[PDB]
Symmetry: C3
Subunit: 192 residues, 3 copies
């Protein structure tokens, strides 16, 4: 099936969404119009449609078992979406929870999703930690560069695993400070 | 008491078992009583009821397809166990054999356990090597720190795959010298 | 019964090379492995389905059809282990502009059922220089960190194959001037 479906992951702060946007932006110039979607958002939308919530807070409290179903359906919806346009699913490779690294796209989601590319945007633990500091929305944690680095290591493994299970290729892009443009150009080459 | 299955993994010497023992102790006096059990142990117990072996090293040389049945059965037996008590499985992410790294939880075993967390305990290659050099009943082979770190790199990857194959969270706890109590407390919290 | 091992490594590691040196030895010891490149087998299937007639036409091959050939490939190689132990030469992940592509997707793994996955590697510096000196490869512009990243992703994928098929994952270093030690280690896991 034409219309590529890719998922752009990265650690909070690498600005995967940012370079994704500028890539779409710049790509649109050549008639290519990707549909960005946030996986967590889709589950929320499937929740409302299945009559199960009314806001993003009834999702966390939503039954653990049925939460797998919502993931399956959310994977179906997006799959159906590439029928009408190339899609970028903005989600996590692994979500860093206090209980540990949680897979953003478990296998039962990948079967319904069938991605073509898994982007893993990265940069230095240093850069990421500073970005979060010059960020007013944050200013809370104590996440060290080794922790960010460790996270980026697990995401990588998760991505590759996703790749093997889905056949999708895993692309690693470095979004380094004062070099945004190069990251963006890198991404554009893989989405085009 | 009811359900919550977890697997604690670690390379020999990191003391994943130890910190698990402490955690389980401080937990029983909180009402939470986990039944710990070794995956190797159960497989043996299972092979015996099937009258397949006498001693453990008899399973060394055991039919490849038999080992798969045993595993699937030992993962199922351990599975039923979560019905009457939260369980912690003491096992290896991968076993460093001279034939390479053997996955401790093959997909068919994962589909039986359906664990919730995959604990991965680590420390520097140096710390482990010195813990191995000092061990009395050990003193064998000649593994290098890089080797130990290689094993930990692979266990991390293995762990992550398990998480992707079951939706289970992957938590890395650092059990470093003279910091045993921080690791125990950290393990307790995820078992909470 | 016949062992089925798949050998991997980034281009330049001499992964195929140590495997050949290893087969010569195991041969004069009775054990005879049949080496085969997964890419060739794929092409072989395709050039029989009349879908392709040139190694290059494979690239142009349909994306869904590409999968059907990978399955058929695993099935042939699988059937090969009925006759002799088999070594499959392939990449854990092929480093493309689109990124790291898994050399053995799960639908291939199920047909293959390998017993051992081998990861042949060395330092970013050795690979890079080995490539540099080859009259053919002189302008790929991939740095040592680049190769190292590729090797990192190779381990992950190789490990995933093990988790999915139960196969063991043996990492082996093939460093300059120590070729024989790499070949030796390989012989130990193959016999």
């Amino acid at each position: 099936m034409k219309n590529k479906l890719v998922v752009v992951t990265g650690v909070p702060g690498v600005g995967g969404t940012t370079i994704t946007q500028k890539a779409m932006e710049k790509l649109s110039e050549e008639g290519i119009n990707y549909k960005m979607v946030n996986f967590g958002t889709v589950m929320f939308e499937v929740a409302q449609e299945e009559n199960l919530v009314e806001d993003r807070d009834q999702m966390r409290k939503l039954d653990p078992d049925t939460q797998k179903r919502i993931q399956k359906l959310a994977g179906r919806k997006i799959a159906e979406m590439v029928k009408e346009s190339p899609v970028v699913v903005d989600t996590h490779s692994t979500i860093k929870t206090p209980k540990g690294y949680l897979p953003g796209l478990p296998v039962w989601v990948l079967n319904e999703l069938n991605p073509d590319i898994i982007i893993v945007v990265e940069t230095s633990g240093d850069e990421i930690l500073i970005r979060r500091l010059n960020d007013e929305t944050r200013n809370r944690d104590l996440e060290t560069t080794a922790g960010i680095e460790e996270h980026q290591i697990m995401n990588r493994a998760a991505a590759m695993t996703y790749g093997v299970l889905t056949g999708a290729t895993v692309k690693i892009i470095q979004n380094k400070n004062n070099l945004l443009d190069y990251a963006v150009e890198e991404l554009i080459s893989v989405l085009r």
